[PDB]
Swiss-Prot record:
Forms a complex with SENP6 and UBE2I in response to UV irradiation. Forms a tight complex with RANGAP1 and RANBP2. Identified in a complex with SUMO2 and UBE2I, where one ZNF451 interacts with one UBE2I and two SUMO2 chains, one bound to the UBE2I active site and the other to another region of the same UBE2I molecule. Interacts with SETX. Interacts with HIPK1 and HIPK2. Interacts with PPM1J. Interacts with RASD2. Interacts with TCF3. Interacts with NR2C1; the interaction promotes its sumoylation. Interacts with SIAH1. Interacts with PARP. (Microbial infection) Interacts with human herpesvirus 6 IE2. It comes from Homo sapiens. It is an enzyme of class 2 (transferase). The gene is UBE2I. It is found in: Nucleus; Cytoplasm; Cytoplasm, Perinuclear region. Keywords: Acetylation, ATP-binding, Cell cycle, Cell division, Chromosome partition, Cytoplasm, Host-virus interaction, Isopeptide bond, Mitosis, Nucleotide-binding, Nucleus, Phosphoprotein, Transferase, Ubl conjugation, Ubl conjugation pathway. This is SUMO-conjugating enzyme UBC9. There is a cross-link at K17 (Glycyl lysine isopeptide (Lys-Gly) (interchain with G-Cter in ubiquitin)). PANTHER family: UBIQUITIN-CONJUGATING ENZYME E2 (PTHR24067). The modification Phosphoserine is found at S70. There is a cross-link at A48 (Glycyl lysine isopeptide (Lys-Gly) (interchain with G-Cter in SUMO1)). The lineage of its organism: Eukaryota, Metazoa, Chordata, Craniata, Vertebrata. InterPro entries: Ub_conjugating_enzyme, UBQ-conjugat_E2_core, UBQ-conjugating_AS, UBQ-conjugating_enzyme/RWD. Pfam families: UQ_con.
Length: 156
């Protein structure tokens, strides 16, 4: 898709020029070694001073041919303990749904910062996994203990 590819080239240029410290967002490669702009390997650092601190959380960003009409699918690899991350790793967030708050102008930087924000502030109305949601509701102290253990596990 020329439209998707043009926008993705724009995103890549902007990202490389200026991006938040500790974040990574890089296109992958096709079997023939050429660049695949439709599938990016990204990483989000845990925010300092939070239970996520010290962790580096890898996630894939997958674009459909009709991007930026549609949002990318964003999927933590491996899946994370968080109330709004499905067991598959897929992130549940309103800016990531075409029929909710996605807007075509939203940038890769804005997506990754939005997901970082989500990490430290779950949305309890729409849980995506039972376990992290249940613990977050029942015992915030235990919830944070689990988050800290996960951040240590994913220290770079």
């Amino acid at each position: 898709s020329g439209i998707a590819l043009s926008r993705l080239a724009q995103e890549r240029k902007a990202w490389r020029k200026d991006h938040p410290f500790g974040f990574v967002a890089v296109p992958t490669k096709n079997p023939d070694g050429t660049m695949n702009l439709m599938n990016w390997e990204c990483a989000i650092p845990g925010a300092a001073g939070t239970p996520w601190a010290g962790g580096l959380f890898k996630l894939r960003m997958l674009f459909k041919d009709d991007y930026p009409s549609s949002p990318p699918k964003c999927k933590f690899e491996p899946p994370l303990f968080h109330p709004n991350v499905y067991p598959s790793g897929t992130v549940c967030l309103s800016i990531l749904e075409e029929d909710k708050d996605w807007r075509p102008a939203i940038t890769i930087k804005q997506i990754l910062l939005g997901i970082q924000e989500l990490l430290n502030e779950p949305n309890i109305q729409d849980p995506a996994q039972a376990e992290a949601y249940t613990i977050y509701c029942q015992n915030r102290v235990e919830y944070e203990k689990r988050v800290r253990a996960q951040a240590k596990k994913f220290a770079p």
